[PDB]
């Protein structure tokens, strides 16, 4: 997509050379923001073939709040396998914080229900927020939240959402991330009888791995195509009642897929 | 400053009309980002006279972690008076979360010390973060955090910082906010023997109150002047040992101050 390709070029042009966790070098920039008007089409990259299967399953899984990968395993979704222990547990990652943020006084805060309550009764609130950055539980998580915090906003009958992503592997992870949150905005908008607005993506340490350079140049040589259209075939009674089969994509005509090699 | 004035104009040009908490209407946009290269000067607005007195005192107060306004009162800093109760308490706002985020297992997490530890031992970390958004303590706070979350980054011997501000009164609050965090970056950089990099400001619900419109047009009619220079007269042994007198501003030549009327 235009916004995505321009970010790749920006990292190439002004990114600084360094390293990651402890291995493959990277080119990185700090602080970036882009916007996707969801009325213009569903933001699924077209310059390389992507699939929504895992994205949809993972989001439904997040919304349910159970951090065990049993559900993902049952549906052959393996993106969390590398981090799950022998019992399939990941610790209190995303879902747990979204649906049951633990407090010192023994309560479990449902941030998703809270946000839906705000959107329906106080849409102009300046604090319609969901945070996965629970400082006191970071050490227990298999991975520290990447998509750490997001906020909603309502104007002119449209629902917008801004995500703060602390770090981002532009080539491998970003396409997945943008589609995931775009899907959530559509679901929340449907439950609130609102039209979709903008998805605003804000990133911290935004990078490209050294071994993804040839792949990046290849993708940049391709012209983006018209964005597809998301179809929700059914209207669930609540945000927790969506099903995999409820979502379909129309008019998706991407360029060939590009593999993403990763070091271990 | 150029970046600040362009934001005011953006809100004027594309902001939508609505309301706030429950009173004065506003023009607002959702999702914005701007960058200040601290090497180009200290980002204290020049198109209207500003002062650093309260900003400095408030930041030292945040760093100490005590949320009672006694210190502010002793120094005639009254910006938190409206929210403090009879005993001068504000609940677990900013400072408490920065220095003693409470966990369900009875610990108090010092995020400032943690970040300094990361900057000195693992500067390439993609999670050098401080969050004030403690979901389980929001109801006990006098006010929900506005400057909610910030992240540091190091490259080419320079320290950068990105702040996520969930909501922002562009005319009254933003000038204060930008200078406050810029000051923190300078202090953290000094303690880490690093040069200052960029301060990246990211906002959510960014607005201008209807009764600040004439004031905004007046400020936009003024040409920004060269940014001043921050001087730190002393090098404290730690981030918790700074004093008010350690900071001085040179070359600050602003336009006349503009009052900000507020409804109650």
Distance CA A248, CA A232 (A): 7
Please state, as a whole number, how many other Cβ atoms lie within 10 Å of the Cβ of residue A39.
10
Out of B30, B103, B127, closest to residue A200 by CB: B30
Give B248-253 contacts, CB < 8 A, sequence gap 24+.
B249/B42, B249/B44, B249/B52, B251/B226, B252/B44, B252/B46, B252/B228, B253/B46, B253/B225, B253/B226, B253/B228
Cβ–Cβ contact A124 with B under 8 A: yes
Closest-CA residue to A138 (of B112, B100, B129, B123): B129
- CA angle A166–B130–A55, rounded 5-degree value: 30
Q: Which two tokens stand for residue B109?
A: 């997490």
Q: Which two tokens stand for residue B20?
A: 């706030």
- Is-contact B7 B224, C-beta < 8 A? no
Residues from chain B that touch A144, judged by Cβ atoms under 8 A, are 127
DSSP state of A181: H
Cβ–Cβ contact A190 with B under 8 A: no
Cβ-in-10-Å burial (0-12, 13-18, 19+) of B128 comes to buried
Distance CA B197, CA B18 (A): 37
Out of A19, A20, A204, closest to residue B151 by CB: A204
* Å between B217 CA and nearest CA of chain A: 24
Q: Collapse the DSSP code of A8 into the 3-class scheme (helix H, G, I; strand E, B; otherwise coil) and give the result.
A: helix
Taking CA atoms, B262 is separated from A87, A125, B25, B209, B211, in Å, by: 57, 19, 12, 9, 8
Cβ–Cβ contact A110 with B under 8 A: no
Domain carrying residue A186: 2-264
Put simply, the answer to whether A164 touches B164 (Cβ < 8 Å) is yes
Closest-CA residue to A8 (of A157, A144, A208): A208
Distance CA A146, CA A158 (A): 26
Q: Which residues pair with B130 in a beta bridge?
A: B150
Residues from chain A that touch B16, judged by Cβ atoms under 8 A, are 155-156
- Is-contact A244 A232, C-beta < 8 A? no
Q: What is the CATH number of the domain that holds B245?
A: 3.30.572.10
Closest-CA residue to A104 (of B163, B196, B120, B92): B92
What phi and psi values does residue B27 have, to the nearest 5 degrees? -115, 125
DSSP β-ladder status, A229-232 and A247-250: antiparallel
Residues from chain A that touch B103, judged by Cβ atoms under 8 A, are 104, 135-137
Q: Which two tokens stand for residue A70?
A: 């049993």
Put simply, the answer to whether A30 touches B205 (Cβ < 8 Å) is no
B65's torsion region: left (phi>0), alpha (psi -120 to 50) or beta? Answer: left
SS (H, E, C) B196-264: EEEEEEEEEEEEEEHHHHHHHHHHHCCCCCCCCEEEECCCCCCCCCCCHHHEEEECCCCCCCCCCCCCC
State the structure-solving technique. X-ray
Taking CA atoms, A71 is separated from A99, A101, B190, B201, in Å, by: 17, 21, 49, 39
Cβ within 8 Å of B, A 209-248: none
* Å between A136 CA and nearest CA of chain B: 5
Distance CA A65, CA A48 (A): 31
Put simply, the answer to whether A153 touches B103 (Cβ < 8 Å) is no
Give the count of domains, chain A. 1
Residues of A with catalytic function: 146
Q: Provide CB contacts within 8 A for B215, sequence distance 6+.
A: B171, B258, B259, B260
Please state, as a whole number, how many other Cβ atoms lie within 10 Å of the Cβ of residue B10.
15
Distance CA A130, CA B29 (A): 20
Q: Which residues pair with B19 in a beta bridge?
A: B25
Cβ within 8 Å of A, B 50-89: none
Cβ-in-10-Å burial (0-12, 13-18, 19+) of A264 comes to exposed
Put simply, the answer to whether A136 touches B33 (Cβ < 8 Å) is no
Closest-CA residue to B33 (of A159, A206, A114): A206
B62's torsion region: left (phi>0), alpha (psi -120 to 50) or beta? Answer: alpha
Cβ–Cβ contact B137 with A under 8 A: yes
Cβ–Cβ contact B139 with A under 8 A: no
DSSP E strands: which ranges in chain B? 16-19, 25-37, 101-102, 108-109, 129-131, 147-155, 158-169, 195-209, 229-232, 247-250
């Amino acid at each position: 997509m235009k916004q995505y390709l321009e970010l790749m070029q920006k990292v190439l042009d002004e990114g600084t050379q360094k390293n990651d966790r402890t291995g493959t070098g990277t080119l990185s920039i700090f602080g970036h923001q882009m916007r996707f008007n969801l009325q213009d089409g569903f933001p699924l990259v077209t310059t390389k073939r992507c699939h929504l299967r895992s994205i949809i399953h993972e989001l439904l899984w997040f919304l349910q709040g159970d951090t065990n990968i049993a559900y993902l395993h049952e549906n052959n979704v393996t993106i969390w396998d590398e981090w799950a222990d022998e019992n399939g547990d990941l610790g209190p990652v995303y879902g747990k914080q979204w649906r049951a943020w633990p407090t010192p006084d023994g309560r479990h805060i449902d941030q998703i229900t809270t946000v839906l309550n705000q959107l329906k009764n106080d849409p102009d609130s300046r604090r319609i927020i969901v945070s996965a950055w629970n400082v006191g539980e970071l050490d227990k998580m298999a991975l520290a939240p990447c998509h750490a915090f997001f906020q909603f906003y309502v104007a002119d009958g449209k629902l917008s959402c801004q995500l703060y992503q602390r770090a981002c592997d532009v080539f491998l992870g970003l396409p997945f991330n943008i589609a995931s949150y775009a899907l959530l905005v559509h679901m929340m908008a449907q439950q609130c009888d609102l039209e979709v607005g903008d998805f605003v993506w804000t990133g911290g340490d935004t990078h490209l791995y050294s071994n993804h350079m040839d792949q990046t140049h290849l993708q940049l040589s391709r012209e983006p195509r018209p964005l597809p259209k998301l179809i929700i075939k059914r209207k669930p009674e609540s945000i927790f009642d969506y099903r995999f089969e409820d979502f379909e994509i129309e008019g998706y005509d991407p360029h060939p897929g590009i593999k993403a090699p990763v070091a271990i």
